[model samples]
Target: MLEVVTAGEPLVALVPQEPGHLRGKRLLEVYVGGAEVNVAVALARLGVKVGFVGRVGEDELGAMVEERLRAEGVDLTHFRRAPGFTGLYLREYLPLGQGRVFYYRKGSAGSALAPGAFDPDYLEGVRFLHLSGITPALSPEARAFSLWAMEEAKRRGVRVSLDVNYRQTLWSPEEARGFLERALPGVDLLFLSEEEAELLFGRVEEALRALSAPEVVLKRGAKGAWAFVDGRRVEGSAFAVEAVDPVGAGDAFAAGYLAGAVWGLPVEERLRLANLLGASVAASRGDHEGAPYREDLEVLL
Candidate 1:
């Protein structure tokens, strides 16, 4: 049985060798990236029985994505091959771990995902069904599928984990808030960034008090994280690591915290795990290239 199941789109990223405008670059490097896929890979590396469900284009980029996730030991029983091009994006490398992304994913194969694609049997014995806000913003059909998946997971007695991965590039803050606020009742675990909390509730304190999830985690880049679990509040300090790229750090953090919960670790340890995984990704180059393996965490722990 799977410990966690996550579904969403995965994209191919093109990054220039130098930090400059895309037009000025002479060469581009290809890498695989996507929030849900990153979390699945990270969880698998941490020894969690995580499965991923998504549709990839029947193209080389899609093959690369499937290969990478399979190498990481992520279950792909629900992965599908669609009849179009895979989603693609370009990242402008910048100094101090800050970068701007240009998405070219509209009408891509993954955007064709619909509610019927997910098998309810997939959640039969899963501990968590993880979903990200980005999925709902992909397309109308994706939004329906995301919402339906949440309800189906709840109905099956599986815990729902949601990451408020608010992407202004995808939807306006107002739209995101309206949709997410109504979806909160089904969420058992909530992940929010400080900025996202403020966007949704106008204040971080109010967001912490208002969100009805049994557990909430507030991610503060470079500062640390605040976690409310089992009726107790815990704060974790960030690891002091030099920042290289912060693209997939949030997913890594989510995977770490979820892994901690799977292992029955205390809340303090869970936050520590989250912070360390986030720092590792921030200290590396590609989206999830710096995600630590069990051995890496063993030494750090």
Candidate 2:
């Protein structure tokens, strides 16, 4: 009976203790990350009933991630343990530049997920289903699982939200474009970065129009975000903050925007809430560290 349920790959992230000059730095801060999981955590913090479905290895990091999600009030009842080891990513901030990320997720447990990994019964009574391009980039089996889950969600009459979180390090543009074009038709609401939209459709406006979904949100870092609904464009600016990390801002935006949508807020209010949520995350270092609750959002709003 969750308000929203998300499916995707989950990874154990190793964030650097210091930015610039990796030498003599031996400490790596641990955090749980994945597009859907991050969004689910933010949604839960905002007082939404959320559930996350993914597979992790039987390692200590995996257990810690599950515990953290549970503590954040996310239901992990459909999460499974795979036979292989968990996925891990190393993140290094580039000192006022876009950060660098290296993945060690090949053959990881999440990448081993296949078409039948999820049960349709798990999504029963769920209002929304969230997905992302990152899941399909994991492995062939994982891609199939993502497709299957989307199909099941569609069949169950659940609204689907998609984020085109494209990573150049993971796959080629041609490959990513092909898969995303095929998946877009099944999605109800779509979110993408401006760069991702350009990469997918050569122009942001064309891409947004081509999706033809009821709602399309384009995220622009520092500049804020814009949404197209029913042929009208609504834009919002970012709130000024001392940003420590920008990695999780988009996920936070999606969570806040979706919450606003669920609460039947106007387009301008939704965009404002999204900007506030993203700004809160950008002001903190660790992922999900600055996620605000409903009361906090009320004060900021």
Who wins the lDDT comparison? 1
TM-score of each: 0.96, 0.94
- Report lDDT (CA) for all predictions: 0.87, 0.82
Show where candidate 1 strays beyond 4 Å. 96-98
Q: After superposition, how far is residue 186 of candidate 1 from its true place, in Å?
A: 0.4
Candidate 2 structure quality by residue, lDDT tens digits, 38-99: 89999999998998888888888778778888889998888867677888888888676766
Q: Where does model 2 exceed 4 Å of error?
A: 96-98
Clashing pairs in 2: none
Output the number of the TM-score-best candidate.
Answer: 1
